[PDB]
Amino acid sequence: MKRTWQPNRRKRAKTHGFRARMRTPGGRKVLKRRRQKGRWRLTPAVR
Amino acid sequence: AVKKFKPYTPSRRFMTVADFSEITKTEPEKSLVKPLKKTGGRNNQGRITVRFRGGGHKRLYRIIDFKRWDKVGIPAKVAAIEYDPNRSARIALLHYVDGEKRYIIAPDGLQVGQQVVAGPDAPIQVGNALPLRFIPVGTVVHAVELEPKKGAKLARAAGTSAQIQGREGDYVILRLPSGELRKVHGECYATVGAVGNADHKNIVLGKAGRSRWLGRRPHVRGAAMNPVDHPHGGGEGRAPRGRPPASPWGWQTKGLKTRKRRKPSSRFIIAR
RNA sequence: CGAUGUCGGCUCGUCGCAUCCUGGGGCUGAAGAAGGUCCCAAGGGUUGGGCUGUUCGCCCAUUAAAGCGGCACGCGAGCUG
RNA sequence: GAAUGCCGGCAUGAGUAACGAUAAAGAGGGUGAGAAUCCCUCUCGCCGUAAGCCCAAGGGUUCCUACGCAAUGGUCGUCAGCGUAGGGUUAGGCGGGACCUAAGGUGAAGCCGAAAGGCGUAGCCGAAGGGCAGCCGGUUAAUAUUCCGGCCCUUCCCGCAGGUGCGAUGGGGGGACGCUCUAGGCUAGGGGGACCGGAGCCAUGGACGAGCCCGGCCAGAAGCGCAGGGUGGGAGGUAGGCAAAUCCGCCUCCCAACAAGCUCUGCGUGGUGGGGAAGCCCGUACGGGUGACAACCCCCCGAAGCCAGGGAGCCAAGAAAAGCCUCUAAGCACAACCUGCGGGAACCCGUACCGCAAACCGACACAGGUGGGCGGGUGCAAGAGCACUCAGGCGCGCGGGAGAACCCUCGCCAAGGAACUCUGCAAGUUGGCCCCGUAACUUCGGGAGAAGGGGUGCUCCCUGGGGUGAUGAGCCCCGGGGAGCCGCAGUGAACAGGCUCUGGCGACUGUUUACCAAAAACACAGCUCUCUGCGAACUCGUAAGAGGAGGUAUAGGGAGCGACGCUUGCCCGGUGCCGGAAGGUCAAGGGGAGGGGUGCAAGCCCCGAACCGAAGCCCCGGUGAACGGCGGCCGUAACUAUAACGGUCCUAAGGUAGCGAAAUUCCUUGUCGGGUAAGUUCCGACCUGCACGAAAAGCGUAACGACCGGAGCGCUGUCUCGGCGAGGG
RNA sequence: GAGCUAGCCCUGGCCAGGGUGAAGCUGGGGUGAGACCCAGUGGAGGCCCGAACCGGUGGGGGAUGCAAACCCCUCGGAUGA
RNA sequence: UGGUUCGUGGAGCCAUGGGGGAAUCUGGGCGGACCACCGCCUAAGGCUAAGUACUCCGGGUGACCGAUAGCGCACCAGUAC
RNA sequence: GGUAAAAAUGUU
RNA sequence: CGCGGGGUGGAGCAGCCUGGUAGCUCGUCGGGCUCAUAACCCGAAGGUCGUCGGUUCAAAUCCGGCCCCCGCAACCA
RNA sequence: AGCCUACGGGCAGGCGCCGAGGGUAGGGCCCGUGACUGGGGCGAAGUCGUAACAAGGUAGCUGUACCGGAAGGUGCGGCUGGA
RNA sequence: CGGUGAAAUGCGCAGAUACCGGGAGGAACGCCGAUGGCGAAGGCAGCCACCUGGUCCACCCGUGACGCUGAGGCGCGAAAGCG
Ligand SMILES: [Mg+2]
Ligand SMILES: [Mg+2]
Ligand SMILES: [Mg+2]
Ligand SMILES: [Mg+2]
Ligand SMILES: [Mg+2]
Ligand SMILES: [Mg+2]
Ligand SMILES: [Mg+2]
Ligand SMILES: [Mg+2]
Ligand SMILES: [Mg+2]
Ligand SMILES: [Mg+2]
Ligand SMILES: [Mg+2]
Ligand SMILES: [Mg+2]
Ligand SMILES: [Mg+2]
Ligand SMILES: [Mg+2]
Ligand SMILES: [Mg+2]
Ligand SMILES: [Mg+2]
Ligand SMILES: [Mg+2]
Ligand SMILES: [Mg+2]
Ligand SMILES: [Mg+2]
Ligand SMILES: [Mg+2]
Ligand SMILES: [Mg+2]
Ligand SMILES: [Mg+2]
Ligand SMILES: [Mg+2]
Ligand SMILES: [Mg+2]
Ligand SMILES: [Mg+2]
Ligand SMILES: [Mg+2]
Ligand SMILES: [Mg+2]
Ligand SMILES: [Mg+2]
Ligand SMILES: [Mg+2]
Ligand SMILES: [Mg+2]
Ligand SMILES: [Mg+2]
Ligand SMILES: [Mg+2]
Ligand SMILES: [Mg+2]
Ligand SMILES: [Mg+2]
Ligand SMILES: [Mg+2]
Ligand SMILES: [Mg+2]
Ligand SMILES: [Mg+2]
Ligand SMILES: [Mg+2]
Ligand SMILES: [Mg+2]
Ligand SMILES: [Mg+2]
Ligand SMILES: [Mg+2]
Ligand SMILES: [Mg+2]
Ligand SMILES: [Mg+2]
Ligand SMILES: [Mg+2]
Ligand SMILES: [Mg+2]
Ligand SMILES: [Mg+2]
Ligand SMILES: [Mg+2]
Ligand SMILES: [Mg+2]
Ligand SMILES: [Mg+2]
Ligand SMILES: [Mg+2]
Ligand SMILES: [Mg+2]
Ligand SMILES: [Mg+2]
Ligand SMILES: [Mg+2]
Ligand SMILES: [Mg+2]
Ligand SMILES: [Mg+2]
Ligand SMILES: [Mg+2]
Ligand SMILES: [Mg+2]
Ligand SMILES: [Mg+2]
Ligand SMILES: [Mg+2]
Ligand SMILES: [Mg+2]
Ligand SMILES: [Mg+2]
Ligand SMILES: [Mg+2]
Ligand SMILES: [Mg+2]
Ligand SMILES: [Mg+2]
Ligand SMILES: [Mg+2]
Ligand SMILES: [Mg+2]
Ligand SMILES: [Mg+2]
Ligand SMILES: [Mg+2]
Ligand SMILES: [Mg+2]
Ligand SMILES: [Mg+2]
Ligand SMILES: [Mg+2]
Ligand SMILES: [Mg+2]
Ligand SMILES: [Mg+2]
Ligand SMILES: [Mg+2]
Ligand SMILES: [Mg+2]
Ligand SMILES: [Mg+2]
Ligand SMILES: [Mg+2]
Ligand SMILES: [Mg+2]
Ligand SMILES: [Mg+2]
Ligand SMILES: [Mg+2]
Ligand SMILES: [Mg+2]
Ligand SMILES: [Mg+2]
Ligand SMILES: [Mg+2]
Ligand SMILES: [Mg+2]
Ligand SMILES: [Mg+2]
Ligand SMILES: [Mg+2]
Ligand SMILES: [Mg+2]
Ligand SMILES: [Mg+2]
Ligand SMILES: [Mg+2]
Ligand SMILES: [Mg+2]
Ligand SMILES: [Mg+2]
Ligand SMILES: [Mg+2]
Ligand SMILES: [Mg+2]
Ligand SMILES: [Mg+2]
Ligand SMILES: [Mg+2]
Ligand SMILES: [Mg+2]
Ligand SMILES: [Mg+2]
Ligand SMILES: [Mg+2]
Ligand SMILES: [Mg+2]
Ligand SMILES: [Mg+2]
Ligand SMILES: [Mg+2]
Ligand SMILES: [Mg+2]
Ligand SMILES: [Mg+2]
Ligand SMILES: [Mg+2]
Ligand SMILES: [Mg+2]
Ligand SMILES: [Mg+2]
Ligand SMILES: [Mg+2]
Ligand SMILES: [Mg+2]
Ligand SMILES: [Mg+2]
Ligand SMILES: [Mg+2]
Ligand SMILES: [Mg+2]
Ligand SMILES: [Mg+2]
Ligand SMILES: [Mg+2]
Ligand SMILES: [Mg+2]
Ligand SMILES: [Mg+2]
Ligand SMILES: [Mg+2]
Ligand SMILES: [Mg+2]
Ligand SMILES: [Mg+2]
Ligand SMILES: [Mg+2]
Ligand SMILES: [Mg+2]
Ligand SMILES: [Mg+2]
Ligand SMILES: [Mg+2]
Ligand SMILES: [Mg+2]
Ligand SMILES: [Mg+2]
Ligand SMILES: [Mg+2]
Ligand SMILES: [Mg+2]
Ligand SMILES: [Mg+2]
Ligand SMILES: [Mg+2]
Ligand SMILES: [Mg+2]
Ligand SMILES: [Mg+2]
Ligand SMILES: [Mg+2]
Ligand SMILES: [Mg+2]
Ligand SMILES: [Mg+2]
Ligand SMILES: [Mg+2]
Ligand SMILES: [Mg+2]
Ligand SMILES: [Mg+2]
Ligand SMILES: [Mg+2]
Ligand SMILES: [Mg+2]
Ligand SMILES: [Mg+2]
Ligand SMILES: [Mg+2]
Ligand SMILES: [Mg+2]
Ligand SMILES: [Mg+2]
Ligand SMILES: [Mg+2]
Ligand SMILES: [Mg+2]
Ligand SMILES: [Mg+2]
Ligand SMILES: [Mg+2]
Ligand SMILES: [Mg+2]
Ligand SMILES: [Mg+2]
Ligand SMILES: [Mg+2]
Ligand SMILES: [Mg+2]
Ligand SMILES: [Mg+2]
Ligand SMILES: [Mg+2]
Ligand SMILES: [Mg+2]
Ligand SMILES: [Mg+2]
Ligand SMILES: [Mg+2]
Ligand SMILES: [Mg+2]
Ligand SMILES: [Mg+2]
Ligand SMILES: [Mg+2]
Ligand SMILES: [Mg+2]
Ligand SMILES: [Mg+2]
Ligand SMILES: [Mg+2]
Ligand SMILES: [Mg+2]
Ligand SMILES: [Mg+2]
Ligand SMILES: [Mg+2]
Ligand SMILES: [Mg+2]
Ligand SMILES: [Mg+2]
Ligand SMILES: [Mg+2]
Ligand SMILES: [Mg+2]
Ligand SMILES: [Mg+2]
Ligand SMILES: [Mg+2]
Ligand SMILES: [Mg+2]
Ligand SMILES: [Mg+2]
Ligand SMILES: [Mg+2]
Ligand SMILES: [Mg+2]
Ligand SMILES: [Mg+2]
Ligand SMILES: [Mg+2]
Ligand SMILES: [Mg+2]
Ligand SMILES: [Mg+2]
Ligand SMILES: [Mg+2]
Ligand SMILES: [Mg+2]
Ligand SMILES: [Mg+2]
Ligand SMILES: [Mg+2]
Ligand SMILES: [Mg+2]
Ligand SMILES: [Mg+2]
Ligand SMILES: [Mg+2]
Ligand SMILES: [Mg+2]
Ligand SMILES: [Mg+2]
Ligand SMILES: [Mg+2]
Ligand SMILES: [Mg+2]
Ligand SMILES: [Mg+2]
Ligand SMILES: [Mg+2]
Ligand SMILES: [Mg+2]
Ligand SMILES: [Mg+2]
Ligand SMILES: [Mg+2]
Ligand SMILES: [Mg+2]
Ligand SMILES: [Mg+2]
Ligand SMILES: [Mg+2]
Ligand SMILES: [Mg+2]
Ligand SMILES: [Mg+2]
Ligand SMILES: [Mg+2]
Ligand SMILES: [Mg+2]
Ligand SMILES: [Mg+2]
Ligand SMILES: [Mg+2]
Ligand SMILES: [Mg+2]
Ligand SMILES: [Mg+2]
Ligand SMILES: [Mg+2]
Ligand SMILES: [Mg+2]
Ligand SMILES: [Mg+2]
Ligand SMILES: [Mg+2]
Ligand SMILES: [Mg+2]
Ligand SMILES: [Mg+2]
Ligand SMILES: [Mg+2]
Ligand SMILES: [Mg+2]
Ligand SMILES: [Mg+2]
Ligand SMILES: [Mg+2]
Ligand SMILES: [Mg+2]
Ligand SMILES: [Mg+2]
């Protein structure tokens, strides 16, 4: 049947994108934890 | 002059449609100070507040002159009687001699091609607006303002009407459609006559879908729920309320009054 | 109880005898036929339906007879549910 | 040495199950170290409202070519969506952006919040919506509405030429709209042809024949032509469209009333440009030439698409802003704008490829899921159905043998027909169209496809309407009658209701436990109670704010009951709610009688009784479609039996109507009656209702149901009771 | 975290083909005028049959599956909630 | 009401949200209710090094480890997945 | 006259 | 078998807790009223308090044991 | 494919329509019967009450509606077969 | 206070009945008024206006036998009752 992952570039970049993280104080702490950990990708890779 | 249907399918033997003969030949609308975009929405910023709203047909908001002191002394010609989906009552297109076009909420007996005027002068003929201090005692009236210069806020559903019972100082006493006797200030305008489309009470929606056409989603009884959701819920089959009857939020719903007791408007109210 | 799946049916049986019938026998208030009761005997046989989930039971039509029980109230790594 | 311990390695099951739809394979010839699996050719099979083409999303090199087979491929592999390398995506006109707005997001002003932050008018963002200028062919191994060819357009900017008061984000018009059914005329698409153009072919008994086979097109400015959509023209007067208007609006007499006329599309026709089969010959995986100077014509069917903003009907009353036209404001009238021509300028992103799938979502080359358009022909009444088949694409990436049990998926059967069984579960029967014919009941619609029947193919003759053609031929759609022919059988294959009688529940269509429950549960129109006079009640939120509602008692919220019909009895004692400016009680506070602690005292500090003190509670009333409740023991009548009647006790009042062994009845398989040969089920009754009962409704009710129970007819491998055959294991 | 699912808001799209023939118009009849009755026209409907589409009733298969909900036959809705 | 050892305790002191509401040396706070005596401070404005805490970074040292250990990573690791 | 009220039963 | 309440004149009910004395209504009996009955009026009678025991000076009353009656309970697999 | 006497004929035979009747299916009318149930009538001298006839001790009757063991009671309007 | 043959329930010191003044609301129309009138019956009663029917008289003017009854049908039809 219909599974959970149905991709959308529009949905992925507006929900998990960098600018959506920097709006909220919660997403600003998300990137802070990812800078500190050493992640190569702070955000999901969207093209 | 309610339309009946034959029982050619079920839910048409009971189904009932209002009569549209008072609607003159004006099925589309006027514009530019006439329908705005109407925002459909069942809910506030976010969560649902009035449960069981949604769906329904798309509507455009016919913007109505509720404050008819704008054109005191300026007469009008009744050009049309139209359908308003936003209201139980009908609406009347007026062309002014001044040149404007507005809708007044259409009273009963108002015919097309009739002079109608607002103001203190304003003879007592159906559709004319006056202050309450100038209208004779005993005449039925509608579109009544509550406080002066604030807009018509009383007796504007279909077939409703308010009646003047007396005067007392700067205030007059109105018998509302609720039967409440209320002191309303004399400078409040009010349009004489009943509202009409009085057959709106006698409609039968016939089927479940006709309520969905009006935006009325189905209403779930609390007794058909679980006790997380409602006080009446729960119980192995069909409990009989188990408690004094209450809302989903706990407040009782059989007789419990909830008017704010210390309201400053209470010293203008005489009856129920 | 870090699992022994429970009634009833179906399929498949096997065993016990304190035997329903068939076989042999004593007594009879056994004339004969047909019974009663008891002893020997398990070699084989022990029907088809209506009702009910039923085991059982009660009916219908028969029959030489329509036997009782055990095997985790036999049998769900065989089935039904 | 153990922790169903952790990590890693290797055994066992085991050469066992499996190798992923039962659409299907066989041969020849190449290549090669190595071929069932790669290439080619012939034959066979499968899809064909797709298993074929074109888009969108997603995927991101998978595209093309060259060299290759370690691993990936459920086998092999010389192949590949795989490894190395190289090549490939060309735009003023397609899509998106230098255009607009919707929901929603954001948000100068402003309001709010311990902080973080939450709202919020204008604005801005926001798109498959509005707006907007390219059609047909040809080329590459791989791109084209992008490059090339022909024809045609759109913006700007600079020039001269001719017109006009020009002129804004401001005013107005327009943009601009539903659902359903539809008229006229075209187009797309399709069919036929004695006509036109063709390489060729007479096979096996016959045929040189209006023979067979193949093909008879596409785009195309201005200009006409045919359909069609939009719209009145003046004159004044004018307070409104938040400044101004000659515009719009509103009045008023004049002329039109029509599309006459202006425009604006669509479709033909059009200068000219392009394509062009079968078959044959070849050298490639893929194409190329000839056929051809190709012909390029006539009929008929015809849309759900076009003319579009068409028409009619209906209620549930059917987006916004910009572009566009017009109007005037500052300002400007050497400017500026409109029209025509000329030259110049025309940027950013995407363009490969897969795309109902081996490239997307499912860990897989997974029998799953995935939005829009084209989707041909013939026959079956119709059709996107069903069978076959064009174009096109495939034979599903293990095969070969055998012909056991057993399993799956099928086929058939003697005699019996439900004896099977929880149950006719399953499988059969019936099945489409036409024509007869059709019950109780009923809300007069229905029930109804009731039930039960008959006809159905083919040839010949005669004959009635239409549509396109001119009133005719032809081509097409519908009919009627008569005479015959063949077979076991004529919707001869495939697609295609078994029916009736009777109860239970729910009125009905609908909704639900995604993944064991689709129901009698939920919902539902409808009925009643109750709250709510508007800054409403209620809801979310600390607030602001917002929903309700841009609503106003015919409205909104809450609760129950659930169409409809006839009805919904008694109890306010207790609980709840409603109504009572008395009284009792009652907290902070007021009040100070009186007392205490210290001081040499003025004083300073503690407690502190009367009394005045709200809601709430107590008290008095009311209220059942508010929470709820609706009796016990005795005796009695011309035979028993029973008790209309009575006595007594208790309660706040003591179950009325209507139903009743019921979805409710323990004893119980109650007892009669019916169906049966036989009936713990079913139906009709009796009432001794353990333990019905009136809006947690009562009793009924036509129609309705993948609900539940009972019966009968038809039919059958369900069974007696099995047997044989098929295919995949 | 609402790219699954539940609801709603904005905006687009889809629903082959057959049946049944409500209102209303037109004409006739009727009346003092009506109601009303016939025809023809008309095409209404949480209408009927049935594909796409949305579902998931009964049975069989499947059960280390093709599949962590599948497949075949059968079945419900299919202009509307 | 909070803070202090202090949980209403005899509950001061220090801060406070609400109500009343002064004084400028004969002024005011405190010394654990309160009063008296004896004493200590001088509130309702602000700044102020040093000694103190920590280790992303550099160095030294180790009765610290030695690729299942030592950081998750000795190896292009916050990577592949 | 337009103008007021009293408690069972009895064989044929 | 469990828990709770009950048995009192002929019928139905009190009185039992807090031992000393048994009351109410209807009925029965006797007498009135009536022609006669019922209704009504005036009198009167009637109870081993289910039994068997023991507590006490003393038991309907308190305690136990049996016999009946009413109500509830009898669950999970 | 038979037989004939006068044969472009007849008989037998064959095909066909109607066809008594039988079969299947569905309606209509009527009769008998049926657990149980309703009310009617006559019966032995039964039980309960007093409705009506006298102002029958609430004038009576009546159509309708509701209620009650039962006659009946009451509401609305009517009647004189009462004052 | 109500109420009756008499009482009782009930209402009332929470300020009733009785009284005055004001306000709302519905239904029925005293006196006239009766053995009266009208109408086909049922039935019709304050007053005003509009719309409308039947009928009586006088004049003897016009038509000129047009008449009477009426199975059905159609319409009206107190009160109670139903939506
Ligand atoms: Mg989305
Ligand atoms: Mg505008
Ligand atoms: Mg918002
Ligand atoms: Mg938000
Ligand atoms: Mg509901
Ligand atoms: Mg539930
Ligand atoms: Mg929840
Ligand atoms: Mg709760
Ligand atoms: Mg229950
Ligand atoms: Mg409950
Ligand atoms: Mg165990
Ligand atoms: Mg253990
Ligand atoms: Mg074990
Ligand atoms: Mg023996
Ligand atoms: Mg023997
Ligand atoms: Mg013997
Ligand atoms: Mg013997
Ligand atoms: Mg003998
Ligand atoms: Mg059975
Ligand atoms: Mg047993
Ligand atoms: Mg045995
Ligand atoms: Mg046992
Ligand atoms: Mg067993
Ligand atoms: Mg099993
Ligand atoms: Mg078993
Ligand atoms: Mg076993
Ligand atoms: Mg075992
Ligand atoms: Mg079961
Ligand atoms: Mg089952
Ligand atoms: Mg170990
Ligand atoms: Mg291991
Ligand atoms: Mg091994
Ligand atoms: Mg082997
Ligand atoms: Mg092998
Ligand atoms: Mg093995
Ligand atoms: Mg094997
Ligand atoms: Mg195998
Ligand atoms: Mg495979
Ligand atoms: Mg395969
Ligand atoms: Mg070779
Ligand atoms: Mg095929
Ligand atoms: Mg896209
Ligand atoms: Mg893409
Ligand atoms: Mg991928
Ligand atoms: Mg690659
Ligand atoms: Mg190669
Ligand atoms: Mg390889
Ligand atoms: Mg290599
Ligand atoms: Mg391999
Ligand atoms: Mg090779
Ligand atoms: Mg490739
Ligand atoms: Mg490659
Ligand atoms: Mg630019
Ligand atoms: Mg630029
Ligand atoms: Mg844009
Ligand atoms: Mg933009
Ligand atoms: Mg914008
Ligand atoms: Mg906004
Ligand atoms: Mg801030
Ligand atoms: Mg915001
Ligand atoms: Mg767009
Ligand atoms: Mg667009
Ligand atoms: Mg474009
Ligand atoms: Mg390509
Ligand atoms: Mg091209
Ligand atoms: Mg070009
Ligand atoms: Mg101008
Ligand atoms: Mg504008
Ligand atoms: Mg064409
Ligand atoms: Mg054509
Ligand atoms: Mg030719
Ligand atoms: Mg030949
Ligand atoms: Mg052709
Ligand atoms: Mg004009
Ligand atoms: Mg102006
Ligand atoms: Mg015209
Ligand atoms: Mg052309
Ligand atoms: Mg042209
Ligand atoms: Mg060619
Ligand atoms: Mg070729
Ligand atoms: Mg139109
Ligand atoms: Mg607009
Ligand atoms: Mg704008
Ligand atoms: Mg325009
Ligand atoms: Mg491309
Ligand atoms: Mg492409
Ligand atoms: Mg597709
Ligand atoms: Mg998976
Ligand atoms: Mg694989
Ligand atoms: Mg995949
Ligand atoms: Mg993959
Ligand atoms: Mg495969
Ligand atoms: Mg797949
Ligand atoms: Mg799909
Ligand atoms: Mg087609
Ligand atoms: Mg076709
Ligand atoms: Mg066809
Ligand atoms: Mg044919
Ligand atoms: Mg067909
Ligand atoms: Mg199509
Ligand atoms: Mg098909
Ligand atoms: Mg092919
Ligand atoms: Mg055969
Ligand atoms: Mg057979
Ligand atoms: Mg046979
Ligand atoms: Mg048979
Ligand atoms: Mg049977
Ligand atoms: Mg059996
Ligand atoms: Mg059955
Ligand atoms: Mg079946
Ligand atoms: Mg058949
Ligand atoms: Mg029926
Ligand atoms: Mg019919
Ligand atoms: Mg039929
Ligand atoms: Mg039927
Ligand atoms: Mg034939
Ligand atoms: Mg044509
Ligand atoms: Mg013609
Ligand atoms: Mg035949
Ligand atoms: Mg068929
Ligand atoms: Mg049935
Ligand atoms: Mg039943
Ligand atoms: Mg239902
Ligand atoms: Mg489920
Ligand atoms: Mg689950
Ligand atoms: Mg299910
Ligand atoms: Mg269902
Ligand atoms: Mg109802
Ligand atoms: Mg909120
Ligand atoms: Mg709040
Ligand atoms: Mg608001
Ligand atoms: Mg609103
Ligand atoms: Mg309401
Ligand atoms: Mg409501
Ligand atoms: Mg219900
Ligand atoms: Mg009925
Ligand atoms: Mg009370
Ligand atoms: Mg009560
Ligand atoms: Mg109460
Ligand atoms: Mg109260
Ligand atoms: Mg005090
Ligand atoms: Mg005090
Ligand atoms: Mg004080
Ligand atoms: Mg108080
Ligand atoms: Mg009730
Ligand atoms: Mg007796
Ligand atoms: Mg009694
Ligand atoms: Mg009662
Ligand atoms: Mg029974
Ligand atoms: Mg029986
Ligand atoms: Mg029987
Ligand atoms: Mg029964
Ligand atoms: Mg019974
Ligand atoms: Mg019961
Ligand atoms: Mg019940
Ligand atoms: Mg009940
Ligand atoms: Mg109830
Ligand atoms: Mg119900
Ligand atoms: Mg019932
Ligand atoms: Mg019902
Ligand atoms: Mg029914
Ligand atoms: Mg169902
Ligand atoms: Mg349904
Ligand atoms: Mg049977
Ligand atoms: Mg079989
Ligand atoms: Mg076999
Ligand atoms: Mg086989
Ligand atoms: Mg969603
Ligand atoms: Mg489609
Ligand atoms: Mg249709
Ligand atoms: Mg018609
Ligand atoms: Mg239709
Ligand atoms: Mg339908
Ligand atoms: Mg249906
Ligand atoms: Mg259907
Ligand atoms: Mg789906
Ligand atoms: Mg579902
Ligand atoms: Mg299924
Ligand atoms: Mg299954
Ligand atoms: Mg499928
Ligand atoms: Mg069906
Ligand atoms: Mg503290
Ligand atoms: Mg403290
Ligand atoms: Mg403490
Ligand atoms: Mg303290
Ligand atoms: Mg303070
Ligand atoms: Mg201080
Ligand atoms: Mg202090
Ligand atoms: Mg101190
Ligand atoms: Mg101190
Ligand atoms: Mg001290
Ligand atoms: Mg100090
Ligand atoms: Mg200082
Ligand atoms: Mg420090
Ligand atoms: Mg370091
Ligand atoms: Mg490590
Ligand atoms: Mg090592
Ligand atoms: Mg590690
Ligand atoms: Mg008597
Ligand atoms: Mg007693
Ligand atoms: Mg007693
Ligand atoms: Mg006596
Ligand atoms: Mg006496
Ligand atoms: Mg349990
Ligand atoms: Mg339990
Ligand atoms: Mg249980
Ligand atoms: Mg002759
Ligand atoms: Mg009487
Ligand atoms: Mg009497
Ligand atoms: Mg009387
Ligand atoms: Mg009464
Ligand atoms: Mg009377
Ligand atoms: Mg008199
Ligand atoms: Mg004369
Ligand atoms: Mg009447
Ligand atoms: Mg009446
Ligand atoms: Mg009424």
Residue numbers in the entry:
A (entry chain R7): 1 to 47
B (entry chain RD): 2 to 273
The authors write:
To better understand how each of the ram mutations impact ribosome conformation, we solved structures of programmed ribosomes containing P-site tRNAfMet and lacking A-site tRNA. In the 70S-G347U complex, determined at 3.2-Å resolution, B8 is disrupted, with h8 too distant from h14 to form the triple base pair. Nucleotide G347 normally participates in a base triple interaction with C342 of h14 and A160 of h8. In the 70S-G347U structure, the 30S shoulder is rotated inward and intersubunit bridge B8 is disrupted. In the absence of A-site tRNA, the mutant ribosomes exhibit a partially closed (on) conformation, with the 30S shoulder rotated inward.
During protein synthesis, ribosomes select correct aminoacyl-tRNAs (aa-tRNAs) by monitoring the nucleotide (nt) pairing between the anticodon of the tRNA and the codon on the mRNA in the aminoacyl (A) site. Ribosomal ambiguity (ram) mutations increase miscoding and map to disparate regions, consistent with a role for ribosome dynamics in decoding, yet precisely how these mutations act has been unclear.
